[PDB]
Symmetry: C4
Subunit: 388 residues, 4 copies
Amino acid sequence: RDFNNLTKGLCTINSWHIYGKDNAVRIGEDSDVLVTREPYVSCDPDECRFYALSQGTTIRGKHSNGTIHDRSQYRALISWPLSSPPTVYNSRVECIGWSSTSCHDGKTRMSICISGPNNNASAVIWYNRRPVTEINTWARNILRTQESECVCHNGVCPVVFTDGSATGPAETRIYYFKEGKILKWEPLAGTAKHIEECSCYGERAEITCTCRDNWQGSNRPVIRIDPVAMTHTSQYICSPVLTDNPRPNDPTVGKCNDPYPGNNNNGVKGFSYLDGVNTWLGRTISIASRSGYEMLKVPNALTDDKSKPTQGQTIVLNTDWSGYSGSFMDYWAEGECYRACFYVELIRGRPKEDKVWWTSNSIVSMCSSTEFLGQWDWPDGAKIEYFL
Amino acid sequence: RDFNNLTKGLCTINSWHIYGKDNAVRIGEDSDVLVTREPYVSCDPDECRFYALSQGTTIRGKHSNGTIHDRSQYRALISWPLSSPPTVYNSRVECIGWSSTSCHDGKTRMSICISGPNNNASAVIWYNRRPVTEINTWARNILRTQESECVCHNGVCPVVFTDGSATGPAETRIYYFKEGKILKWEPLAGTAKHIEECSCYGERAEITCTCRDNWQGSNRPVIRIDPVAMTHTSQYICSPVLTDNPRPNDPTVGKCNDPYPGNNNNGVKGFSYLDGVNTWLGRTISIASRSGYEMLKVPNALTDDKSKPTQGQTIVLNTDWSGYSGSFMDYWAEGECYRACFYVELIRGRPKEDKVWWTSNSIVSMCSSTEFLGQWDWPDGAKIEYFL
Amino acid sequence: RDFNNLTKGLCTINSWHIYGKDNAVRIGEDSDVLVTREPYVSCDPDECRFYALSQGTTIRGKHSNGTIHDRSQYRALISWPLSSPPTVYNSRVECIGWSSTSCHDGKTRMSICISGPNNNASAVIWYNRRPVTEINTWARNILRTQESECVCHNGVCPVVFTDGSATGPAETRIYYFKEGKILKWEPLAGTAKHIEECSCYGERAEITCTCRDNWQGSNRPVIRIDPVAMTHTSQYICSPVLTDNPRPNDPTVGKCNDPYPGNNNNGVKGFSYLDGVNTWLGRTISIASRSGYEMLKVPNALTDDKSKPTQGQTIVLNTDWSGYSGSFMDYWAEGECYRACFYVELIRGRPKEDKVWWTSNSIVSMCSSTEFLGQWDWPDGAKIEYFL
Amino acid sequence: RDFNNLTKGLCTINSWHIYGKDNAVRIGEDSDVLVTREPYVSCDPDECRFYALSQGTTIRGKHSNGTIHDRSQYRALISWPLSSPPTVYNSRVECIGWSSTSCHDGKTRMSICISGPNNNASAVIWYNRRPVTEINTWARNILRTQESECVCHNGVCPVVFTDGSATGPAETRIYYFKEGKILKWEPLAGTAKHIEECSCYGERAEITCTCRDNWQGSNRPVIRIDPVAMTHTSQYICSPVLTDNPRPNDPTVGKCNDPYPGNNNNGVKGFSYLDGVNTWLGRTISIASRSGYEMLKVPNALTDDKSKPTQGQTIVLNTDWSGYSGSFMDYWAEGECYRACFYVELIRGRPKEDKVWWTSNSIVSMCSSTEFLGQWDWPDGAKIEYFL
Ligand SMILES: *[C@@H]1O[C@H](CO)[C@@H](O[C@@H]2O[C@H](CO)[C@@H](O[C@@H]3O[C@H](CO[C@H]4O[C@H](CO[C@H]5O[C@H](CO)[C@@H](O)[C@H](O)[C@@H]5O)[C@@H](O)[C@H](O[C@H]5O[C@H](CO)[C@@H](O)[C@H](O)[C@@H]5O)[C@@H]4O)[C@@H](O)[C@H](O[C@H]4O[C@H](CO)[C@@H](O)[C@H](O)[C@@H]4O[C@H]4O[C@H](CO)[C@@H](O)[C@H](O)[C@@H]4O[C@H]4O[C@H](CO)[C@@H](O)[C@H](O)[C@@H]4O)[C@@H]3O)[C@H](O)[C@H]2NC(C)=O)[C@H](O)[C@H]1NC(C)=O
Ligand SMILES: *[C@@H]1O[C@H](CO)[C@@H](O[C@@H]2O[C@H](CO)[C@@H](O[C@@H]3O[C@H](CO[C@H]4O[C@H](CO[C@H]5O[C@H](CO)[C@@H](O)[C@H](O)[C@@H]5O)[C@@H](O)[C@H](O[C@H]5O[C@H](CO)[C@@H](O)[C@H](O)[C@@H]5O)[C@@H]4O)[C@@H](O)[C@H](O[C@H]4O[C@H](CO)[C@@H](O)[C@H](O)[C@@H]4O[C@H]4O[C@H](CO)[C@@H](O)[C@H](O)[C@@H]4O[C@H]4O[C@H](CO)[C@@H](O)[C@H](O)[C@@H]4O)[C@@H]3O)[C@H](O)[C@H]2NC(C)=O)[C@H](O)[C@H]1NC(C)=O
Ligand SMILES: *[C@@H]1O[C@H](CO)[C@@H](O[C@@H]2O[C@H](CO)[C@@H](O[C@@H]3O[C@H](CO[C@H]4O[C@H](CO[C@H]5O[C@H](CO)[C@@H](O)[C@H](O)[C@@H]5O)[C@@H](O)[C@H](O[C@H]5O[C@H](CO)[C@@H](O)[C@H](O)[C@@H]5O)[C@@H]4O)[C@@H](O)[C@H](O[C@H]4O[C@H](CO)[C@@H](O)[C@H](O)[C@@H]4O[C@H]4O[C@H](CO)[C@@H](O)[C@H](O)[C@@H]4O[C@H]4O[C@H](CO)[C@@H](O)[C@H](O)[C@@H]4O)[C@@H]3O)[C@H](O)[C@H]2NC(C)=O)[C@H](O)[C@H]1NC(C)=O
Ligand SMILES: *[C@@H]1O[C@H](CO)[C@@H](O[C@@H]2O[C@H](CO)[C@@H](O[C@@H]3O[C@H](CO[C@H]4O[C@H](CO[C@H]5O[C@H](CO)[C@@H](O)[C@H](O)[C@@H]5O)[C@@H](O)[C@H](O[C@H]5O[C@H](CO)[C@@H](O)[C@H](O)[C@@H]5O)[C@@H]4O)[C@@H](O)[C@H](O[C@H]4O[C@H](CO)[C@@H](O)[C@H](O)[C@@H]4O[C@H]4O[C@H](CO)[C@@H](O)[C@H](O)[C@@H]4O[C@H]4O[C@H](CO)[C@@H](O)[C@H](O)[C@@H]4O)[C@@H]3O)[C@H](O)[C@H]2NC(C)=O)[C@H](O)[C@H]1NC(C)=O
Ligand SMILES: CC(=O)N[C@H]1[C@H]([C@H](O)[C@H](O)CO)OC(C(=O)O)=C[C@@H]1NC(=N)N
Ligand SMILES: CC(=O)N[C@H]1[C@H]([C@H](O)[C@H](O)CO)OC(C(=O)O)=C[C@@H]1NC(=N)N
Ligand SMILES: CC(=O)N[C@H]1[C@H]([C@H](O)[C@H](O)CO)OC(C(=O)O)=C[C@@H]1NC(=N)N
Ligand SMILES: [Ca+2]
Ligand SMILES: [Ca+2]
Ligand SMILES: [Ca+2]
Ligand SMILES: [Ca+2]
Ligand SMILES: [Ca+2]
């Protein structure tokens, strides 16, 4: 095997088709399905899999009580076959912790998990299913990372981490790994003012990450990485189609180099594909809660501070719960272009559905089509009343 | 691996032997078995597997209520090891949707699933476990396909689809795929007046499909495809041994080029092997309901409008529930001829057994013998009372 | 891979060591374990596995009621990893039916299952996981076979079948298979008067089978097969150490060429290793019921009508239930000799424990040591009261 | 594959990072998790796995009552994927018995299990998943072994066994195996006065084992083995940092060549890494019970009878239950040095938590870092009240 190189551009996105769906909450009402959150999707050269952070309990188990909580000793990054649910019996543990990323370089997989108390967390970088490198907290305040796949180019896999406040300036670092070893790291540069939970993809030897400015911004920060020079830039999505949550209503003109104000100290992981006229943004439909999900075609969203939608697709109705969303691609597919994909975490239970004592999710995932396909909506599909 | 070519003829069918049986409803009374319907069987060069459309719930799960319904967002094409039941833990998702087909070309597998609302459905064609092509609805009325295996010849895998009314003329198309890409498609030609749910097999470079005329016919339409020329014909089975369900009583003379009347706007998926004197037709025993199943040797059924049985075999007694049936063969077996096989879906629950709130099925499957073997009957075997 | 040849002799048996044990009834009290009976063990070149006839239900499932019955449509030959229990999720179906045998020839595996009603049963011979040959009943009275592994030599795998009465003369045939095809068959010859359920092993190009004379004999019939000439002989074990069950008390002098009388129309599958002074016989400890199990070293048991034990080993105490027993060896092990192995079926439930409505079993298995090892007893270990 | 040679030294241990954790008791509250105890970890060239002795029952099963007991016929050595729990469906049985060790030699795995009654136990040595050698009890008093991995060098895998009293002099033997065959054995020599449950690791062609002196010592005995000469020495850890349990309080000066007194006839399996200044000792925090766990850096612990800690790391708080602990390394990792690892058995249930009727455990495991990482504590995490 050789290292994968990002030699292709994105395919033209004219609509989205269903890729995978696990129905995990429905199925786990009467089967041994692990409680999860913070899911994602990532491909190897011969398989694509679902990933998430387990809570170390099944959803029917009594230990599901309290699973709203973000960072226990009972969490782990798990992976499982595409569109199956994350069960006790089919889930492979990648590493232990409560914040993660993972990516394949074409030869083997790197997985990273962070664990520890808030003031003393540490990352362990696994490569080829073995621990290789460890990184201690630098700011002593919830060292944390992407919660979706990283991207590699000629063996170099950049990863974005943040340590520090969620409600003020923090210390974001871009690490450049190869074979699980640190080649370099850099502090965040550019105009993004706060970074969390980056969702990344690669095309034509560039990695684009769309992140969460938890502190101030309802527009999303964007980091663009050159994995050969091992350098980066940052800015925000200029468009007035705002894509964090909660958020104010859409204005007429956005902000390219500062957070678009109105909502502080909150957010949701999300994503975009930023490719000129071939630009699509994901967002929750609700401005107030993690409800609904839609894709909007917003030509030149990155650079045009008045750009508005020219096409769209509903993924989850506003009467259904959504959650985190992120990017991935099958870098090992056939053909001349990389097909954009994404997933949406469909969160069930607390805090929105507090008649149960747990929080979990299922997954839906879509990839782009060059056709203009009809649209459906893709809810989680479980009935909370069945769990009472 | 090279593409498989249909170089052999059918083996002489002198009886049927048991091939597989999953006992899924019996077992799922106390294990984590998925609710399914629309099953089939399909072989790879090194394994044969069971397939079906999951309902995204176990049979004991509370989400089994409502599984009579045909087309939710919680359905998927799954496959699992031959004669095991479709469990949460052993079922592999092939694609997401509520109508499917799948076949191996000798190199790798093509799977197709259709999803969406009734007026906006779309097919995704997967090849080598990756999405490759997408097809939007052309008639905006429940785009739908075979619900059993497709057949390939030198890489060309024809698939029959229908979009449009179930109770009048519809728009049937034969697509010719290779490596998941569309080489060509054609509209239905010939004398079949309505086509659904084709059951296909190949021999000597010809693919024969026996389908369901839902609108008018109690005889079955037959499509015969030349996968090299990428052309086809259609007609009906001429025989007065009528094989849809519900149906009128058997007459003395059938119809070769039009639907045999008596029953409108209903049917069941079924199959036949049409090979001169070596012709066998499957059918439900009941003329009114999906009850019983039998194979009848009807020499020259395709072409002889007075042909009657010369031999038969009971598969399921008329006091037991049956369901869909379809053809498959192990194109990669040893020997000089292809051994005809079929499966019968044994539907349990609604609507016939409405003391439970679910609908599911198990599978029985048989292949031909050149011996004249004794016959048994093969019921599902579950006791509905245990589920109350 | 080449076909395995029986080139080695037996290792010297000085005691028995534990080889495998599945604890299936204990575990299945609270897990998804299939109801089974008629187990055995058989090796491939790279793995050894447990085998049995499933009943198509879990032990806690409501469909376990009635599993005393021998021959339903819901039975199948399954295999699973050595010493795991036969679960819904780990059991591989080999073929469908209610009487079986299986063996590896060094290249791939042959499995045979018989199904059907009592007057119309048929065997299907699978090779390389595909059906190849079928054999119809010849006597119309419960066609039946070994219920333990067959043995192959240079691709030729003999199998013993019986069709006909269990309580009078029957029609026993030795079939010689190669690649799942029939090379030859012969009717039973020699002095054995009734044959069922042969337990076989091979050494130095000879296959020895120890069987059950259900009709008359409390000594066991022995068939010795030359798999090159494809010929055989039969006789009884001469020893007065009688090894069927139920049986009369041991006499002083046995019978070499006729059934030793006292018990009619009953028996149990069992085994022996017949190798001159290196001869060991298995038997139940009880003369009346399938209780206890012991191995007795009986030099020249086959040929010496006064031979008595010179050594022994208790396997299951007389206060614990036993059941069928049979021979197997790992023909692909390292070293200069074949190590004798056996299993004992530990039957729980009906008819002896009729407070439950099911019948199932677990497995214990042992192989020979050249050491004189200490002995333990190996009960099933489940508590029936837990199942009430 | 070639046999692995111990060519590297230990990496510098500056802290410990999380390696694996199975959360088995939490998960098994509502899934089919086997009852276990005496766990460990061991690597193959391509995978690392968890190991333990099953009790042949699930934790929710009724047969969990009585699982405090050490030595039944229902125990087996099982292995399962790293950080998954030991389930019915994912656990591979290595051999049958109630005392074990296992190690890979670079070509394949040797596993050893001991079974039998107290006065008649026997070891079976498996190699390449087949039984090869058997060893009978020599002292007729609970033949027993390491309960963690063995270590191999150029195919020679030494294993320490003891037979005899737990409360006085016993007969300890070091066996030197190759390909599952006995090359040599030696009686214990040196100054250790009683040996049980050795925890071993290898570096620079030497194997170091830290054991349990059940009879007298609260310091731990150490055996150092030359696997080329097939010779050994023994002594105690000199340090006054005492590491058995129960134990007296730490003194100022320890004992190098005799047991440090204060506690008789009890102990716990434990471990150390003894490498000059790079020396780390594990121990329970409590002096009275199997509570808490910590690692202490004790330069020259082996040889310096006044050595005290210079650094430490808490692994399990003193308010949480611990248990056995042992060493392992991934001898097949990349890089220039072997990374020290260990596990801690987190025992739940009897005797400390006697509101339940079972005894089981989960696993936590850590490996060394050259960084000075922040520390967390890693409890089992189950709530006993949920099991009532
Ligand atoms: C079968 O399936 C197919 C395929 O899926 C279905 O067809 C799809 O149908 C959907 C729904 O209609 C479409 O999605 C919407 O797309 C529009 C964009 O298209 C419109 O606008 C285009 C741009 O027009 C402008 O520029 C052009 C270019 O110069 C100019 O010509 C024009 O005058 C104007 O200045 C038009 O080009 C386009 O027309 C074309 O397509 C038409 C078909 O759609 C066709 O009829 C035409 O002939 C022509 O070819 C079309 O007019 C998105 O704008 C829209 O998204 C908004 O609305 C949804 C709610 O519906 C909302 O959730 C979105 O967030 C968004 O609206 C919010 O954000 C705006 C941006 O800031 C803001 O302005 C809004 O006020 C609104 O904001 C509020 O809500 C948000 C969210 O809660 C909140 O944050 C804010 O604060 C605030 O409260 C949809 O995405 C698909 O594109 C269409 N696909 C295709 C291929 O056709 C078909 O319907 C199905 N069939 C059946 C029978 O069901
Ligand atoms: C052990 O196992 C073996 C192997 O399985 C068992 O043997 C099997 O036994 C079964 C049951 O008997 C047989 O199946 C039936 O086969 C007959 C066909 O064979 C008969 O007809 C042949 C043709 O005769 C005509 O042509 C010849 C050729 O010229 C001519 O000579 C003759 O005069 C006549 O004009 C005969 O050749 C054949 O004889 C041969 O075989 C005999 C053994 O079977 C043997 O004794 C003879 O010596 C000779 O060798 C034989 O007479 C099928 O017709 C039959 O199917 C009909 O009946 C079943 C109900 O039983 C029904 O469900 C079927 O649908 C079908 O009948 C319906 O459809 C007809 C067609 O339209 C219609 O005419 C009927 O009125 C009826 O229609 C009604 O019901 C349907 C369905 O509900 C409904 O849709 C309609 O509207 C309407 O209401 C069976 O398939 C096997 O062939 C036989 N196999 C073998 C190898 O022998 C054996 O019994 C077992 N042993 C034990 C002890 O159990
Ligand atoms: C730790 O583990 C070890 C290893 O497992 C334990 O040692 C084992 O201990 C057991 C139990 O004692 C032994 O099994 C029995 O073996 C005897 C055979 O050995 C005896 O007989 C030999 C033959 O003697 C004759 O020939 C010689 C040769 O010429 C001649 O010298 C002699 O005078 C005589 O004519 C002796 O050679 C042998 O001595 C040797 O070994 C001794 C140790 O065992 C040792 O002390 C000596 O120095 C010497 O070295 C020894 O005397 C079997 O006969 C016996 O099986 C019978 O009894 C059991 C019940 O215990 C029964 O279930 C069996 O079925 C069988 O008895 C039935 O069948 C007979 C045959 O028809 C019949 O005659 C009986 O009446 C009886 O029949 C009744 O019951 C059956 C069944 O229900 C029913 O069907 C009938 O109708 C009827 O009702 C045992 O197998 C192991 O061999 C021994 N192993 C070793 C290596 O030592 C050790 O005990 C353990 N330690 C601890 C502390 O627990
Ligand atoms: C974020 O994470 C990091 C990384 O984990 C956290 O930092 C870690 O913090 C822990 C907790 O503080 C540290 O563990 C302890 O380490 C000490 C050892 O370090 C001290 O001692 C060193 C040696 O000093 C001596 O020699 C030097 C060399 O000459 C000499 O200079 C000195 O004067 C003296 O003579 C010092 O070098 C060292 O200083 C260095 O590090 C300091 C940071 O720790 C730093 O501030 C300094 O500047 C300097 O750089 C330091 O002073 C262990 O001794 C200790 O273990 C004892 O205590 C724990 C309880 O806390 C107990 O459980 C242990 O068993 C042990 O104590 C028992 O055994 C002793 C031995 O017999 C005995 O003497 C005791 O009385 C006691 O015995 C009793 O209990 C036992 C057990 O129940 C029982 O068996 C007995 O019978 C009896 O009842 C801890 O392991 C880490 O080392 C430290 N790691 C790092 C890299 O810094 C950080 O805190 C986290 N941040 C936050 C915000 O939480
Ligand atoms: C796409 C779809 O919903 N197809 C239906 C099919 C259909 O209604 C008739 O053929 C009429 O068009 O009928 C049946 C049926 O049991 O009759 C099941 C199928 N269910 C599923 N494939 N999910
Ligand atoms: C084919 C069949 O039903 N064989 C029977 C067998 C048989 O009844 C006797 O050998 C008499 O012929 O007995 C027994 C038995 O436990 O005695 C079980 C077998 N059960 C099964 N193989 N399923
Ligand atoms: C073979 C055996 O039973 N070994 C025992 C061990 C032993 O009792 C002491 O070391 C004293 O000899 O103690 C313990 C223990 O928890 O202390 C568990 C072990 N349990 C098992 N390995 N099954
Ligand atoms: Ca925000
Ligand atoms: Ca019809
Ligand atoms: Ca369950
Ligand atoms: Ca008998
Ligand atoms: Ca001690």
